[PDB]
Amino acid sequence: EIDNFLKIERLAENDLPKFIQLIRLFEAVFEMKNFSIPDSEHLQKLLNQNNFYVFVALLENKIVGGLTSYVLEQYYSEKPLAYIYDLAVDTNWQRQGIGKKLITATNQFYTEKGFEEVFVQADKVDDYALDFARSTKPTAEEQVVHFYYTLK
């Protein structure tokens, strides 16, 4: 069974090729139109940051899913928060346990680092993403409203 072959890996600084592969998976799975990938100098800078962690799911050397996360150091606690910003699984591999393994590995990593909490969000209209998140034993869920300002 694939469970005995799937590997979850946290990307290191030499993993720009795998990071680009995951961004391409995001482009495909989120159906991003007219996307121009940032230059590799920028993506390398991001991968080098101490507050950004990428996890990928691999079968052989093929990336079948992954997630991105940001560290938010807190002023209320000495234990940080982690914000999972994106998670996606290749459409051919969905509903096979990969997303759950990615969440498990991510939360294990941040537990070992002494973080307080990990969080992730889904759009109210995204039935697929909500059903997934509700299957990962989250501590709680809350309805929230997101506001943004597009800058000039």
Which span sits near ligand SIS by CB under 6 A: 15-23, 46-54, 61-69, 116-124? 116-124
Q: Which residue is nearest to Ca ion (CB)?
A: 39
Residues 16, 129: Cα–Cα separation, whole Å = 27
Residues 70, 129: Cα–Cα separation, whole Å = 20
Among 30, 37, 48, 124, binds ligand SIS (CB under 6 A): 30
Contact of residue 16 among ligand SIS, a copy of itself, Ca ion, none (CB under 5-8 Å per partner type): none
Q: How far is the CB of 78 from ligand SIS (least distance, A)?
A: 12
Q: Which of residues 71-130 bind Ca ion (CB under 5 A)?
A: none
Per DSSP, the residues of 32-64 read --S--PPPHHHHHHHHH-TTEEEEEEEETTEEE
Q: Which residues contact 62 (CB under 8 A, 6 or more apart)?
A: none
Q: Would you say 24 is a known binding-site residue?
A: no
